[PDB]
Structures are given as structure tokens and as C-alpha cells.
């Protein structure tokens, strides 16, 4: 007669906080003779992966995964791990809408600290700086200027914008 | 009757001094038939990792890890290792606040030695030198200039800054 033991509940790990829409590698303990199953539900009815250290994509929230290790036919009580999501960085700060005259200077800047900046605009204006180069106020430069922010972890902020209206010079 | 030995306390190693917020690979001795567990606490109640040479992220202080090697069911007395953190490089030196006139020269420099420098400023001024190129004193260049320092190990300093005010030329 062979009475098999039940493997103990395994450890499970995430890959740290993840940017919304990013991915995470989940991982567990190597068990000789084992097969693995990762489930999305606490009821273990939705199967997500069968490897040992699978990568789960498109994580947009604080999702929980459950792990069952089966050895020689006996299944352990599921272990678990959660993947926390780094929150959304705060909306960037920009100046109020401008009115400038043709030939003067359009000066854009922000006051927020970031790993990096990303500015776009009407005449191809592009910058990755806190204080982008000054744009001559040509009429072609009228329009909407847009700013987004990359955080230290790297996760992007939602964008904000500035209108600039260049008046023809008499 | 089989009386199993208790494995001896294992060695454990860090990856040298680490920059604050960096990571370290911890490592230990390969033991045949062993399973591994790394703990954050001296009481061995918080489990950190189960591999042999795990990487621990976001180390911001002089953290200590404890290692238990279990062979054929018998657990050793925990070994340990610490990860020391390279201290924060000293605040950089910059000149006192400037008053310049439109059309003259804005000269920025530092007196501190570094692996590299990183300067930013009002009109897109960017430099990685101890003594950045001289900026013409245009009115668009008024504002705050900021310096940070990269140490030899590579760990960044806290920043310091200089105000420059360009007066209109009569």
C-alpha cells in the first residue's frame, strides 16, 4: 500500500509593482516530480498557465493568482501571489493659454519633476525637457501643445495641454 | 533507523555596495538534495525568496538576509549576509545667483569632481560637463539652472541650483 503525502502550499512571487497594461513574471519553487497550474480564481476554476514561472500579460489592476502543485497525483492547497500596480503619476503642470504676437517668443515649461518629459506641438515642436527650447512666434506655430510625464518607475502620466494663439503683426 | 545530519550553516554573499533603490543578487553554496529559503527576519518568519541566488530589488538601506538550507527534511541554522549601501554623494557646488545684462555671457561651472555631470535649464540648456558651454544672455535664458552629480560608483547626488536674471538692455 502506498499512501502519498500532500505537498505543502508553495510560495509564489510577483515581479514587483507593474505599470498599468504591463506584464509580470510569476514564479514558484521547483518541486521534483511536480506539475504546475496557475489559476485566476480562488475557486481554482479558471486556468491561466501550467508552467513554473509563467509571464502574465496586460495586468491593469491588482490581480491575484493562485498556484497548485501536484506531485505523483496529489494536489496541494493553493498558494498565492498578487501583482501590485504602480499608481498613475499625477497630471503634469503647464502654463495657461497664451496670446502672443507674430515675431515674439513662445515659451513653454513645466514645474513638475520627472524621469523624462515628452512635449509635442503644431509645427513639429518636439521636446523631452522640463524647459524646451523657445519657439519663435510664427503664425504656423499656433495651436495645441501637449505634455506628458514619465515617472521614475517609468510609468506615464495622463496628458495636459496649452493653447497658443499667435496674432498677425500689423 | 536513519538519523540524518543537520547541514552546516551556509555562506551567503551580497553583490557589493548598492546604490539606494538598486538591486542585489544574493548568493550561496550549491548543496545537493537541498531546498533553499531566504528570510528577511532573524526570526525566520518573513520569506523573501526560495531560489539559490535570488535578486532582491529596491534596497534602500543596509538590509540583512538570512539563509536556511534544508536537506532531506533537516534545516540548518541560518547563515546571513548584508548588503551595504553606498552613501549619498555630497551636494554639488554651484555659483551664487547671477544678474547679467541682455547680450553678455552667462557662465556656469562647478568645482566638484565627478564621474559625470548633468545640467539642465530655462532655454533647453543641457550639459554633461564640469564647465558647460557659455550661454549668450538672451532674455529667454532667465530662470533656474540645476546641477546633479554622478559619483564614481555611479550613484547620483542630490541636486543644487542657481538663479540667473537677465536684465533688458536699454
Which residues from chain B sit within 8 angstroms of residue A127, using beta carbons? 124
Experimental method: cryo-EM
**Optimal mutation site among A16, A53, A131, interface B, most CBs of chain B within 10 A:** A131
> Are the beta carbons of A167 and A102 closer than 8 angstroms?
yes
Which residues from chain B sit within 8 angstroms of residue A11, using beta carbons? 47, 50
What is the dihedral angle through the alpha carbons of A47, A48, A50, A53, rounded to the nearest 10 degrees?
-150
Within 8 A by CB and 6+ apart from B39, the residues are: B45, B46, B47, B48, B65, B66, B67, B68, B78
Residue environment code for A30-55, b if the CB has 16+ CB neighbours within 10 A, otherwise e: ebeebebbbbbeeebeeebbeebebe
> Are the beta carbons of A69 and A2 closer than 8 angstroms?
no
> How far apart are alpha carbons A24 and A18 in whole angstroms?
7
> How far apart are alpha carbons B108 and A44 in whole angstroms?
64
CB contact under 8 A, A133 and B121: no
How many CB pairs (< 8 A) connect A and B?
A: 28
SS3 of chain A = CCCCCCCCCCCEECCCCECCCEEEECEECCCCCEEEEEECCCCCCCEEECCCCCEEEEECCCEEEEEEEEECCEECCCEEEEECECCCCCCCCCCCCEEEECCCEECCCCCCCCCEEEEECCCCCEECCCCCCCEECCHHHCEEEEEEEECCCCCECCCEEEEEEEECCC
Instruction: Tell which phi-psi region holds residue B19, choosing left (phi > 0), alpha (psi between -120 and 50) or beta.
Output: beta
* Nearest beta carbon to residue B124 from set A29, A105, A133: A133
Amino acid at each position: 500500500i502506498d499512501i502519498n503525502p500532500i505537498p505543502s502550499t508553495p510560495a509564489a512571487f510577483n515581479n514587483g509593482p507593474i505599470c498599468i497594461g504591463g506584464t509580470a513574471q510569476l514564479s514558484t519553487t521547483t518541486v521534483s516530480g511536480a506539475t504546475y497550474a496557475w489559476y485566476a480564481d480562488a475557486t481554482l476554476t479558471t486556468l491561466v498557465a501550467t508552467n513554473q514561472n509563467p509571464t502574465i500579460s496586460n495586468i491593469t489592476t491588482d490581480s491575484t493568482f493562485y498556484i497548485v502543485v501536484t506531485v505523483n497525483g496529489c494536489s496541494s492547497l493553493a498558494g498565492s501571489t498578487t501583482v501590485s500596480t504602480y499608481p498613475v503619476p499625477a497630471t503634469p503642470a503647464v502654463p495657461a493659454d497664451f496670446a502672443v504676437c507674430e515675431g515674439d517668443n513662445i515659451v513653454l515649461s513645466t514645474t513638475t519633476v520627472a524621469a523624462g518629459y515628452n512635449w509635442t506641438g503644431p509645427n513639429g515642436f518636439t521636446s523631452n525637457l522640463q524647459n524646451p527650447s523657445v519657439v519663435s512666434a510664427s503664425l504656423v506655430d499656433s495651436g495645441t501643445y501637449t505634455l506628458f510625464i514619465i515617472d521614475a518607475n517609468g510609468c506615464p502620466s495622463g496628458d495636459t495641454s496649452v493653447q497658443v494663439s499667435v496674432h498677425p503683426n500689423p
